[PDB]
């Protein structure tokens, strides 16, 4: 009742009765820049969310901008050595890898700037919902530096290796329907991206926990290997998930016609 | 004259004089659901199609719907153990991997529902032709289960890892021009997808057998490795294919101007 | 002052004062077909461009067509053995791999035909700028042969494995906005693709050399491995690039508000 | 007859506990592997698991396990590069079905295990050699690059650089030195066939699924980054270790 | 207390030079690894680097290093396939943090290093065995497929085919033969604990960053094509070899 | 002069059968590898195949093969992390051209084969050691992480965990123990140079293409999943095994 949401500071957490937890970056006056303290909180939260029973996460940023990326001021002031910063990057990965492979569905509800490490963070979620104020960029080059948080991997998977290279090499900005179509977000709304993210999250939370776990962890792992080896692994995932007792009621519903068929959109 | 098309039951096969074989899933009253028997026939057919001389395959489903996926009723009734079903999934892979890496051009002529394992099957073909009635989905989650047939691999290659995840996580349906543009099918027609698939197949069958074999097997293998190692392999594929005696007539046609040049579309 | 641009023949080279070097395929009467001599010049140029101080490359073709691909006449006449041609393909890779992983930003300014090995060459650049006369194809099958220059890898990364297969299997041609949207080029202009490429190149040359080097070499390498291992490598790239002394002035500019913020497009 | 009939170049003997002895049977040609024999290996190893075979003891009739690819057939066929590339894919189909098929294969070696014969031996999970057994890739000296995935499997057995040494120089290994190198896990002073049968009978008394996973998943996981193989392994362990037959054995 | 308190199944002793002795402490159950012990290993190895631990000497209390996965707990829990798949992921979390965590781990082995116990030992960078130490994956005979990534790490240690042999037959290795096979880099006639401490003290006197790279980057690079690992290595070398502390040592 | 001139730190001797002796020639500095020497290795190994070199015997002038990276130059240059990362990429360019270049390289070792010197030796296909030869990665003790892809190649030669042991502890190997470990395929009681020449002359008498494939494809296939390497191998076999020169040899 407070076990999941207590003890944090840079993050604000709200656990709903159906197991959907709203995780809000809460440093709006700094445009939710990710400093080392905030990254450690993300590591802590995503390291235990699955075992804590969280069914889905709606990730958002307080204020008008999702996330401005690496806290550039903390970085500049720290005057870090290469090894000091390499270690900081490894902490980002511990958090973001836990998000991607952890097994808990994450839906990012975007607004305003989703830039640099902020796009890296949005990319670590399974689904992204953008609104009319949302824009994307990897402006790192302007600051004289490289990106991080696995953006070189995830954004390449989202929009194509060559478009990812274009974004960081030129600082090109994308927004609106063009951004959605490019692959920066699966959903675009005329209204509240938060409300749309909550709708998706609630539906996800009503599905089977094991099935969601597999979807949210196995697919990313299988992209990392040869498709011929991935197929063998997929068969074992299917073996466990498809024979689970909890799905028999749904299988029976299909056989007795009480369950809905798959129809084209209206 | 009957060697290629005899001995089957769930599949109907029609071998045309130019070596194009039409393979039709033939359980329309069950919406061509893939039960274990049907999968074994696909294993048998694609395991020997290249050596039998088949030049191209037009894969289609009898009735109004291409394929409804895993036979859910057989699955539910069998009340399978995890290992029993893992083994069933391996049979699906034997068939679908033979389709993808086998070297025989496969063009799927889609109509209606292309869902779950049915999309997995369509994804195992090189080319997909959709019509105005065609719609796509990975509704597995609704049934409480995971997908199979390598859909996590192939559909991710077709539309992007994150869109593949979106489809199975949310049950999102795609159709029409939007589906084509997303990458679910390379061709969309206002008319008969079968006639369009046959047109593509006939043109393919008129090209060189070795060249088609390489195109239909080597490209998928090269995506499975580092691009630096793939390049070395590509050079050996090019070495064998590009120096084949059968292509010299075409090379000569280009040199003497009797062959057509590459021009923009009209 | 002539060290970078002297000693070539099939290539014309022009080094601008800001370190941008214009590399022009110069066999317009042969539509810039890539024969073995031209490939060796590309090997020589891209093998040393980074150490020579070249900041960006604008790659283009003299005449109305970017590049017609493999010199088919030289190939036909040579009546090569499989090993002879496999060796020729390895020379293409030495050049194109040096382009992709070499660390020097390359922007291709396309016009007319970008076909077969010509698309392979355009694909080896980081950015592609197309104009209204530009069209793309992998017509190799028509000539009875396979593609090369890593097109099976790079074009698959650009437009999707299945669209790459479609292009070579059917000889399908793409042009205009449709080509740009498919992923064949990140930029499309109503005017001069060369002028647009120069604008991009000049901006790129004004960024930090180490940062550009990382962007132009590390991202391609990281796509070749599992994302979990790639993340560790990304942290070391970030460690070196993000703590470089040359970027502190830019970081300071952001902290004191003298640097521009990231805003949506107008 | 369902398991043993249908082969001309292979001799099969199915034992009552499910161990099937598969004997290469062209002793007059030292069991050289021609396209027809390769196709029989494709057929046998594609169906053995589903036909109920619990383990296979693979041996060569005569004093020599296998003299390699049939060079007489190769020379007579005068194959083009593409014709031979296709022949190589058939060799891989047979050997891949052996390695990833899930049916434990124990090779009982004797005499020459050379060229494609070493590729065949390497496709088994276990190898038992005797005091007459020797290994080599002699074809390199005559301009041939060994096929059957020997470059893949022998590198895993003895190390990439020792594999390069064998094909580049034709170096021969035998006796205890070969066993210690990694060419065979078992070396006997007596019958390699009898030792292989001892191993096969014990393996056949274990659970079908457990042997299936051991004989297919490990090879697949070795092709992956260890960080992704870990995840796949959890699902393999999840299915194998909670099977009812295993619980009974714990009890 | 910041480093040593917080564990029930592990006994910890932090030495003044930063070497931390981590002792598996359920001697009465031969240090069988139950879910609770695995979670403690996850916690310790997730934080050791940031807590300042310079090297770890891992040992088992009693005469036996580790008897493997706790089969008593497994049998009693009567786990479903998904329940056990989740347990396996926890084992991987602990062992992956050990292998890629960047803190040098030296295992001081004694007696039985079996099943999941061999998986644990393999997760260390270095292993020191004594004259009583033996290695085996006996669980296969009772229908169990070894977890903890043993199929991954033991294949790197002794070769894929020797690893397949161990799990398929339950074959036991000990003494000099085991060391030569690759099961342990060091074998002693005396105390394996004292030899491990000697190794750990020397390692602890080296630079933190250099040890960190050695103990995380090599495993990551082995998961890549050598052509891409080369590029990553250049950046590792770039950071490690230009550190101020290293320059001082050159001088 | 086309093959042998153009180098200052290397001494070259092209024999009539195409074997080229490449001698590291800074004996006064124990052949330490400075940036200039590395660039010469890049040049030689980038062109050897196309210049017609049939095989290379690589040795170090003096009693020691190679003392490693030139630490004097490193200390004086006071390199930044990016400066040194770039130096590392040059080392990889040279060693990658050696490993995948397709020209057989046989290293004749003597004395110290240490640090970057072991990385260089590992870049050859074959290594011949004598009774004075020893191997070590001593730089780790002074805070340096070995470059030149030693973590990649030495892991393939002796196993990832033995490679980690060498860099983490500075452990030295020599004599028969080093050969058995996998540091060298050949050990001689006499001249390692003469034994390397014997090997090189035999290799040079084989077909150019066959040696080219052996010396480039095997390393590339080891970077792939075995299931995809199989397919690539079929095309390598298709081209190599149907060459006219090979047919003649069969006949
Ligand atoms: C693991 S490697 C990762 C590499 C990276 O991620 S590099 C980071 C790339 N990101 C950027 O370049 C985005 C920088 N920020 C902006 O462009 C703007 O602040 C945005 C468009 C996000 C919002 O514009 P606004 O006009 O609404 O706000 P600003 O006036 O620019 O900033 C408001 C406050 O947020 C702070 N802030 C705004 N991004 C800040 C920030 N990334 N850091 C550290 N303080 C920030 C900014 O400094 C200021 O602090 P303060 O009032 O105390 O001086
Ligand atoms: C390797 S892991 C793979 C995982 C999967 O692939 S999971 C499968 C996901 N697929 C689905 O959820 C699609 C289920 N089917 C439907 O939604 C509809 O049947 C569709 C849209 C395909 C067609 O709708 P229709 O209204 O035209 O037909 P239905 O009335 O729903 O079904 C007609 C007959 O086909 C049967 N059928 C229709 N899909 C059937 C089916 N997937 N199985 C087994 N009988 C089926 C359905 O049960 C019924 O049988 P019968 O008249 O004897 O009771
Ligand atoms: C590593 S594996 C790689 C595999 C490949 O890359 S296969 C190559 C696939 N490319 C093609 O099939 C394109 C062939 N060329 C054309 O289709 C046209 O020439 C294009 C559309 C580029 C231009 O059409 P044009 O009507 O403007 O020119 P043409 O009259 O067709 O050709 C003009 C000159 O360029 C020559 N040329 C035009 N492509 C030539 C060419 N690819 N070779 C060798 N001479 C050429 C053509 O032969 C002729 O030479 P010449 O006047 O001395 O006879
Ligand atoms: C996937 S790429 C792989 C490439 C390769 O494997 S190339 C081949 C590699 N193998 C060899 O080079 C082994 C060559 N043969 C031998 O070493 C001997 O035959 C061995 C040691 C196995 C047995 O010696 P024997 O003195 O007991 O018998 P031979 O007199 O040498 O051979 C007896 C018969 O077997 C035949 N044979 C013996 N290897 C034959 C063969 N690889 N082919 C095709 N007929 C053969 C040989 O031709 C002869 O046929 P015939 O009675 O009609 O004259
Ligand atoms: C990631 S998948 C991995 C799969 C596995 O690892 S499966 C297990 C593999 N390991 C084994 O099969 C080793 C089995 N045990 C032994 O071989 C012996 O216990 C050894 C040689 C280690 C020590 O022999 P001892 O004669 O000195 O002691 P035991 O009398 O055999 O065992 C003493 C106590 O430890 C317990 N124990 C001893 N292994 C126990 C155990 N793996 N679990 C759970 N209680 C155990 C054993 O049950 C008993 O508990 P208790 O006093 O309550 O009866
Ligand atoms: C890709 S990252 C790789 C990292 C590394 O490789 S770091 C270096 C690893 N190698 C070593 O630590 C070996 C250090 N040297 C030795 O062990 C000895 O020199 C050996 C055993 C090779 C020969 O001993 P000697 O007693 O016969 O000769 P020395 O008196 O030790 O050295 C003779 C000359 O070679 C020089 N030298 C000897 N290694 C030199 C060197 N690695 N650099 C730069 N000058 C050197 C040494 O400085 C000296 O120069 P000088 O006459 O001007 O004083």
Numbering used by the authors:
A (entry chain B), B (entry chain B), C (entry chain B): 2 to 267
D (entry chain A), E (entry chain A), F (entry chain A): 3 to 253
What do the authors say?
The enzyme DmdD catalyzes the last step of the MeSH pathway, the hydration and hydrolysis of MTA-CoA. DmdD belongs to the crotonase superfamily of enzymes, homologous to the equivalent enzyme in the fatty acid β-oxidation pathway. The structure of the DmdD monomer contains two domains. Consistent with the gel-filtration data, DmdD is a hexamer in the crystal, which is also similar to the architecture of canonical crotonases.
The crystal structure of wild-type R. pomeroyi DmdD free enzyme has been determined at 1.5 Å resolution by the molecular replacement method. To determine the structure of DmdD in complex with its substrate, we created the catalytically inactive E121A mutant (see below). Crystals of this mutant were soaked with MTA-CoA or MMPA-CoA, and the structures of the two complexes were determined at 1.8 Å resolution. Good-quality electron density was observed for both MTA-CoA molecules in the crystal. However, there are differences in their binding modes in the two molecules of DmdD. In the first molecule (molecule 1 in Fig. 3A), the entire MTA-CoA molecule is inserted into a deep active site pocket on the surface of DmdD (to be referred to as binding mode A), formed primarily by residues in one monomer (α2, α3, α10, β5-α2 loop, and β9-α5 loop) but also with contributions from the CTD (α10, α11 and the C-terminal loop) of a neighboring monomer of the trimer. The phosphate groups of CoA are recognized by ionic interactions with Lys31, Arg32, and His66. Moreover, the C-terminal loop of the neighboring monomer provides three additional side chains, Lys258′, Arg262′ and Arg264′, for ionic interactions with the phosphate groups. For example, the long loop at the C-terminus of DmdD is observed only in one of the two monomers in the MTA-CoA complex, where it is involved in binding the substrate. In addition, the C-terminal loop and part of helix α11′ of the neighboring monomer are not ordered in the active site for binding mode B, which leaves the phosphate groups of CoA exposed to the solvent. The carbonyl oxygen of MTA is hydrogen-bonded to the main-chain amides of Leu71 and Gly118, the oxyanion hole of this enzyme.
